[PDB]
Design a protein around this ligand. Structure first.
Ligand SMILES: CCOC(=O)N[C@H](Cc1ccccc1)C(=O)N1CCC[C@H]1C(=O)NNCCCCN
Ligand SMILES: *[C@@H]1O[C@H](CO)[C@@H](O)[C@H](O)C1NC(C)=O
Lengths: 36, 253, 10
């Protein structure tokens, strides 16, 4: 709803919540000069 | 989306479809920021030069979709608009500056595997991620080509943020601090862009700090689709956060 | 091209 978005915000049920990655998210992360 | 690919099921659960009641047609994309609020581009609703001036009663919001044209029984949710709010300083006369709008749902939508809100950036998140070279992601049901087809399912494409000077030198339109541009360089040998029907959709990024997805931009404008030497322009969500808070707090949430 | 949506929505 607001700052930083929500509370449970930005966490996908089918992906982050189950510890699964989507097919191209790696691409983003690698551009941030390699993710977390 | 030009040069993207089919999205995975539940990949952008904040993705919203702006749907014209009659004729029945896709108007624009949008995004779910809470159980009662939708974020989109002001030009999707109001654009006098084209005689465009949509109202609450003219539209429908469809959430949790995958298929472009099918009515996704038991999956998607259809909602009615309670109130539209356009930025008081949106500049439709010149350059689409402040191209942003909020829509308050008639009633809260319930979350599910296919329906979930995205986060709004914080000052430090913006500062860290909004950098030239960093990739973001755009989604939508817009055209596949400038002058073609149309996708059957939601499309997706990852694009790099571009240096302000390169953005400015690519157009004759006056750029502001309320905008940013993105796309590959003709040089890069990688394409892609938003296109007709994708307007108002989200440009998002995944934080490497906390693993959350944040909406950094809204699809605003661009000269053609996927043209060499041209880029896509997006509304700078963070720069407008205060207006967002203000409206949500003074009117509901 | 759009498939018919329920009337409760119109
Ligand atoms: C050959 C097509 O050229 C354009 O007119 N583009 C305009 C540029 C413009 C920008 C600001 C002010 C006036 C004109 C545009 O994007 N417009 C004009 C009005 C709304 C917006 C648009 O179509 N928005 N959708 C952008 C998706 C494009 C993906 N590449
Ligand atoms: C859109 O239409 C409205 C009412 O339903 C207005 O009162 C308003 O002035 C508007 N846009 C104008 C034409 O720019």
């Amino acid at each position: 709803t607001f700052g930083s978005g929500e509370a449970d915000c930005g966490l996908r049920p089918l992906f982050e919540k189950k510890s699964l990655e989507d097919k191209t998210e790696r691409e983003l992360l690698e551009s941030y000069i390699d993710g977390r | 989306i030009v040069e993207g690919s089919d999205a995975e099921i539940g990949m952008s659960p904040w993705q919203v479809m702006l749907f014209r009641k009659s004729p029945q047609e896709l108007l624009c994309g949008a995004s779910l920021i809470s159980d009662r609020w939708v974020l989109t581009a002001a030009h999707c609703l109001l654009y006098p030069p084209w005689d465009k001036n949509f109202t609450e009663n003219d539209l429908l919001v469809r959430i949790g979709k995958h298929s472009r044209t099918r009515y996704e029984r038991n999956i998607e949710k259809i909602s009615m608009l309670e109130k539209i709010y356009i930025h008081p300083r949106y500049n439709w006369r010149e350059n689409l500056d402040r191209d942003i709008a909020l829509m308050k749902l008639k009633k809260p939508v319930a979350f599910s595997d296919y329906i979930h809100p995205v986060c709004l950036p914080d000052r430090e998140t913006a500062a860290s991620l909004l950098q030239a070279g960093y990739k973001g992601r755009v989604t939508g049901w817009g055209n596949l080509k400038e002058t073609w087809g149309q996708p059957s399912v939601l499309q997706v494409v990852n694009l790099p943020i571009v240096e302000r000077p390169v953005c400015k030198d690519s157009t004759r339109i006056r750029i502001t601090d309320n905008m940013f541009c993105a796309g590959y360089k003709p040089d890069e040998g990688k394409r892609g862009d938003a296109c007709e029907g994708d307007s108002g959709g989200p440009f998002v990024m995944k934080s490497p700090f906390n693993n959350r997805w944040y909406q950094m931009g809204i699809v605003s404008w661009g000269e053609g689709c996927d043209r060499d030497g041209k880029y896509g322009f997006y509304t700078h969500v963070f720069r407008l956060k205060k207006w967002i808070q203000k409206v949500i707090d003074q009117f509901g949430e | 091209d759009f498939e018919e949506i329920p009337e409760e929505y119109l």
